[PDB]
Design an enzyme around this catalytic site. Sequence first.
Site, PDB file in Angstrom:
ATOM      1  N   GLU A   1       0.814  -1.210   0.000  1.00  0.00           N
ATOM      2  CA  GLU A   1       0.000   0.000   0.000  1.00  0.00           C
ATOM      3  C   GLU A   1       0.849   1.262   0.000  1.00  0.00           C
ATOM      4  O   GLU A   1       1.769   1.403   0.803  1.00  0.00           O
ATOM      5  CB  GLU A   1      -0.919   0.014   1.223  1.00  0.00           C
ATOM      6  CG  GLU A   1      -1.884  -1.157   1.278  1.00  0.00           C
ATOM      7  CD  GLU A   1      -2.762  -1.134   2.512  1.00  0.00           C
ATOM      8  OE1 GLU A   1      -2.314  -0.606   3.552  1.00  0.00           O
ATOM      9  OE2 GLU A   1      -3.893  -1.658   2.448  1.00  0.00           O
ATOM     10  N   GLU A   2       0.539   2.180  -0.912  1.00  0.00           N
ATOM     11  CA  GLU A   2       1.262   3.439  -0.989  1.00  0.00           C
ATOM     12  C   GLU A   2       0.507   4.527  -0.223  1.00  0.00           C
ATOM     13  O   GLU A   2       1.080   5.551   0.148  1.00  0.00           O
ATOM     14  CB  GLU A   2       1.475   3.837  -2.451  1.00  0.00           C
ATOM     15  CG  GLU A   2       2.658   3.102  -3.077  1.00  0.00           C
ATOM     16  CD  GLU A   2       2.808   3.350  -4.562  1.00  0.00           C
ATOM     17  OE1 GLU A   2       2.442   4.450  -5.027  1.00  0.00           O
ATOM     18  OE2 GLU A   2       3.311   2.444  -5.260  1.00  0.00           O
TER      19      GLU A   2
ATOM     20  N   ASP B   1       2.240  10.910   9.194  1.00  0.00           N
ATOM     21  CA  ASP B   1       3.445  10.360   8.582  1.00  0.00           C
ATOM     22  C   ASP B   1       3.048   8.940   8.197  1.00  0.00           C
ATOM     23  O   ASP B   1       2.205   8.334   8.860  1.00  0.00           O
ATOM     24  CB  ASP B   1       4.608  10.302   9.580  1.00  0.00           C
ATOM     25  CG  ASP B   1       5.117  11.675   9.974  1.00  0.00           C
ATOM     26  OD1 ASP B   1       5.391  12.492   9.072  1.00  0.00           O
ATOM     27  OD2 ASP B   1       5.249  11.929  11.190  1.00  0.00           O
ATOM     28  N   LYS B   2       3.642   8.401   7.137  1.00  0.00           N
ATOM     29  CA  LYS B   2       3.299   7.045   6.726  1.00  0.00           C
ATOM     30  C   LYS B   2       3.711   6.060   7.819  1.00  0.00           C
ATOM     31  O   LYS B   2       3.016   5.079   8.074  1.00  0.00           O
ATOM     32  CB  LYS B   2       3.989   6.694   5.405  1.00  0.00           C
ATOM     33  CG  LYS B   2       3.362   5.506   4.685  1.00  0.00           C
ATOM     34  CD  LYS B   2       3.797   5.463   3.226  1.00  0.00           C
ATOM     35  CE  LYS B   2       3.017   4.424   2.430  1.00  0.00           C
ATOM     36  NZ  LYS B   2       3.249   3.032   2.906  1.00  0.00           N
ATOM     37  N   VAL B   3       4.840   6.336   8.463  1.00  0.00           N
ATOM     38  CA  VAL B   3       5.346   5.494   9.550  1.00  0.00           C
ATOM     39  C   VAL B   3       5.622   6.380  10.760  1.00  0.00           C
ATOM     40  O   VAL B   3       6.301   7.405  10.647  1.00  0.00           O
ATOM     41  CB  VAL B   3       6.661   4.772   9.154  1.00  0.00           C
ATOM     42  CG1 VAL B   3       7.184   3.953  10.333  1.00  0.00           C
ATOM     43  CG2 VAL B   3       6.419   3.876   7.952  1.00  0.00           C
TER      44      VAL B   3
END
Lengths: 325, 325
Positions: free
Chosen positions: B130-131, B320-322
Amino acid sequence: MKTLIEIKQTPDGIIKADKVFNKVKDKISLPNRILYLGCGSSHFLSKLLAMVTNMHGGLGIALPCSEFLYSKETYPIGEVELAVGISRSGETTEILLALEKINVKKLGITTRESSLTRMCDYSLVVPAIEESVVMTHSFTSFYFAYLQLLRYSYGLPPLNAGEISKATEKSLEYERYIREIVESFDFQNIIFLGSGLLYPVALEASLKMKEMSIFWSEAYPTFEVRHGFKAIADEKTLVVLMVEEPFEWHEKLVKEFKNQGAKVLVISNSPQDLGQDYSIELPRLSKDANPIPYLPIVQLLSYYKAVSRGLNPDNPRFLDKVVRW
Amino acid sequence: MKTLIEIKQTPDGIIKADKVFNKVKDKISLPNRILYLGCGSSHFLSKLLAMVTNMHGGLGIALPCSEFLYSKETYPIGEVELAVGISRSGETTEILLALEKINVKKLGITTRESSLTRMCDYSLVVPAIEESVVMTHSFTSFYFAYLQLLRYSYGLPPLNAGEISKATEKSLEYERYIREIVESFDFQNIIFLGSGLLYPVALEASLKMKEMSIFWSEAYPTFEVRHGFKAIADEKTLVVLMVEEPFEWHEKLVKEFKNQGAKVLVISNSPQDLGQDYSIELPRLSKDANPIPYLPIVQLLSYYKAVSRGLNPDNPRFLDKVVRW
Ligand code: NA
């Protein structure tokens, strides 16, 4: 109105709780494995009791009454030595239905003789009577009464009720300051944060906002909020961080929210400046009793926000004093 | 939008999950007492996994990573035979920190080789790539992969992946219906309801709304909502009730919300009319796999609400993605 008068009765509620504890302490002995059942505010109290039971070496589990009724197999209940049913009125239909299915020893926690006390083996009837639809000092009083009984049953020394009662009087001194927060920052949503015993307090605080103010309020274990949830916090948001002993992560969290534009109120037992906008310092108590002074603070915040919106927290729209089926 | 594309890969995600399961099923033996650790959506997945573990006779407990790190004493963790760390990226700092404090066997669940897989004894690397910053089909894929391993580990027959994958294709056929609900009823807040395994789905659904639409969304075990929480539901509210087999109480609850002016969407495996304004019937599956088809429905609902508000679900503000420390 009634809600405010009742919040201010917290100090006396602690004394009333201590009295009940001493009356039943040698008649009831709390065991190792305990199941706590409650609805709404009483469910959050159940979670708090379950947590403190684990903190003191026991094994406590808490579940919303209806989940126990219809989906118990998805929960790690296991063998129960005691089932504790919590209901302010002692008339909540779901708690009564749940106890009917329980065969182990049953302990009720309520403010008066009721359907609940009649189907339990023993009960803690703490007379923290409330006319308001919203539970305030009864939550705090129920907690103290049970905490004393738990410590006693587990061989720990009793807490000093006078000291704890006086601690809540200190909380009430902040009334004007809390009123000023509501007046100076017209927040549109709010987030309560707490860890450990303060997480259930955060959950309860958020419910007080929903009931009293019909408000957009959320609650999360302190650092869980960074994982997506923080997206809804901006310049219209008040973040209330409740923490006994903050560390570097707390300062970073405060800064993170302020960077999104939110204002932060820190309620703690620490003199540390985490960069917050509002600060409320409460008397530090025994770890298990420490959450008590926080309750009147969040109850007052919810009450004054409600009044600022022209609402009557004594009788919120759509809510019944007792939830029956 | 990457988010929509990824939601639509749910059917293939189930197939990929089955492939991973079969490759590792004889290399990993799941024990009786398992601790599930995750953050955000991965915490809700952890709750779902803990519940299904209990459903199948084991003992599962789920906790947010930070609560395990700083307040484990307040939780009934007890003896742990396996610690399962869940992170889509496998890079979430808190999960890495939590697993480092654990000495028992460790199983990671992630989409790629990472810091997480490198510190675990073994992992379920489910390539549901997943982006989008928002987790969608990976939640469903992670669940199925582990569920197969759990069933196998506990001596139960394997689920039919093709059947479950097809069931999610059926969920996707509701895309137009869902889009039209969003285009017709401009709700300002929303409440997701579910019991048992559907409760964690309600929590995840609510988070999807928060992240994708920066929206006022709440989630509660089905009947717990009557206890005060319902106060915030009115004519601007959409209530989403998720239920496999509804009974009388569900009809009453639906009517209760409509009496407050709210509109109700019922997503169920039943053809029963409970008085809902909108209805989505999904294929009924094995009790443990049954929640799967519900995920793409709530993900699509959150996605279209986001688009209707001119928001980009692929990259929500502030996130944030992570999440790292
Ligand atoms: Na993650």
